[PDB]
């Protein structure tokens, strides 16, 4: 567990991507290597897999001597990170001691000591699955549709055809459909190998999208009764990925 | 019995319906060729509400033949609150017993709202002998009602020829909102004799919760008579409250 | 008659009274022709607060009959929260036992707040041998107190000739805020001797709750001494807290 120093410009933007991931997760193992920071976890019900990738190119300074793994209480991490201001510089530093030093540099120098915990790691690999539909979408539309569907039901069907993407949610007598075609502003791209249908639980979806920005481009991949994969990019180089089990 | 009605500015339509559902829970809407109208009482039969939306405020108005539909206002309000300010609102009825509500913007979102049947009654808006008229900025009205609620549960309106006064007394504390024609908040005053009435703040607070701070409100009342309160939607729509006086 | 006092900016006056009410329940206001003065302690006798409003911040200041009034700070503060940022505020004492609070803007709004009888202590604002003075913006002071609250119940203030640091330590966690005159948050540092003290965060939280992020705050303290913080209102008025140290 050798010392490292990592610096990110924009503490608030870092906080907000940690808050997205923390919504499903309570404890995470961060793998720190020469090439960047990666984190891979499952939510307690083992229905969602989260995969974060922060390559070293998004850090203004990145000094890692040898690769190591640190365990972190995501709630306590998140409460500290929330104190960051939008033009603060964030510094994550470890010494010989077994705690993370989190510093905000801006109008003043604020440093928190975060204690490192032991997180037993599951055998987790991001499998490359045969998705038959891919959709790129304005976060606003996606956040919209999940909220709308929650008025009606607990589950949300995704339907991809060659020229339209539909989310549909039916209650006992109420019903909502959101429909997108490439003529529409919210939809940036749509590729379908064959017409695809699946359904996912809104509670999980709501938690996945709660931190996503209204203007960010979100990529969905799914298949008939397959997991749903959702991803967006951080500073164009980082990636956050969710893999969500279908409702069967 | 099909119709199709289009409104530019979905969130504005929501705010208008939200004003009405503050007191109402179920309503019959009469859809005629000349526009949409609605008339209902709150559950305690103290307040009557009248909503008139003429054809001219809709960007497209297609009505095959007059019809009445009954709506759960709360369900209507929950759906209508998901429209965005730049969305186009479409109210369409096919041949079945659902209202089809559509928001057109960055996406097409379509809800199906089931219709209900509503006990409609001998509900007419009579022209009572009002002796005072007041036009004032919604801001002044909304603040005078919040001011008075910290002091009492009733608000006394007092019109004389040169001053409009709203006054509220508790056991200890007092508040008086005074308006003369020299004040920015009073746009018009016409008083044919000294008029004095009192109304309950709980009802008043619900009537004005949804009124905008720069909307222009018209008040008509008479001594121990109902208070009539009007403001205009897009200059041609009209919402009217008629409120029973308190003893 | 006995006095008329006018302040332009009713919301700004409200915020000032709101900062003091965070720790006080009642207070005696002394209205002389030099200005209005107020000196109170919190219920636990740990914080002394001193407010001084010179007549030069009031747009009209007529005190016929010097007096001292007694005010329920929470009643006062819920009345003053009704003022708008563009209202003029008028405080009028007539012959009777009430304070007349008027907001003049869009309309004329008048409240009658009943005066009360406050058991006034004799409170000195003593001169103290402070070894350290710090001037910093509200934003950094307000953030250090919030950061320290995630860790502990008290924070240590530590001043050296070059550095001001606030440090809070829990069972396991730790927060350290450090300022040097290189940093935009610290506008002045004067340190006679290396000075160390600690204070309760709950009191500091309530002290800064009302301070604005742009406000400039002065801290004086000495080793194991009270902490004095003050900020200025319209350059001439002054609000001072004195906070007992922690053991």
Curated annotation (Swiss-Prot), chains B, C:
Gene3D superfamilies: 3.70.10.10. The keyword Coiled coil does not apply. This is DNA polymerase sliding clamp. CDD domains: PCNA (cd00577). GO terms for molecular function: DNA binding; DNA polymerase processivity factor activity. It comes from Thermococcus gammatolerans (strain DSM 15229 / JCM 11827 / EJ3). One of its GO terms (biological process) is leading strand elongation. Homotrimer. The subunits circularize to form a toroid; DNA passes through its center. Replication factor C (RFC) is required to load the toroid on the DNA.
């Amino acid at each position: 567990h050798m010392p490292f120093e990592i610096v990110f410009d924009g503490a608030k933007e870092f906080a907000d991507l940690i808050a997205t991931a923390s919504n499903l997760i309570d404890e995470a193992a961060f793998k720190i290597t020469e090439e960047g920071v990666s984190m891979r976890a499952m939510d307690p019900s083992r229905v969602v897999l989260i995969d974060l990738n922060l390559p070293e190119s998004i850090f203004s300074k990145y000094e890692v001597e040898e690769p190591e793994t640190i365990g972190i209480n995501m709630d306590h991490f998140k409460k500290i990170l929330k104190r960051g201001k939008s033009k603060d510089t964030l510094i994550l530093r470890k010494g010989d001691e077994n705690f993370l030093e989190i510093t905000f540099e801006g109008t003043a120098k604020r440093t928190f000591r975060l204690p490192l915990i032991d997180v037993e790691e599951l055998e987790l690999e991001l499998p490359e699955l045969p998705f038959t539909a891919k959709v790129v979408l304005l976060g606003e539309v996606l956040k919209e549709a999940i909220k709308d569907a929650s008025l009606v039901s607990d589950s949300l069907k995704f339907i991809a055809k060659e020229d339209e993407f539909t989310m549909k949610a039916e209650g006992e007598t109420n019903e909502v459909e959101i429909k997108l075609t490439l003529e529409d502003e919210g939809l940036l791209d749509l590729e379908v190998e064959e017409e695809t249908r699946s359904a996912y639980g809104i509670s999980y979806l709501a938690d996945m999208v709660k931190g996503i920005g209204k203007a960010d481009e979100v990529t969905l991949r799914f298949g008939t009764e397959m997991p749903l994969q959702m991803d967006y990019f951080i500073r164009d180089e980082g990636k956050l990925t969710f893999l969500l089990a279908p409702r069967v």
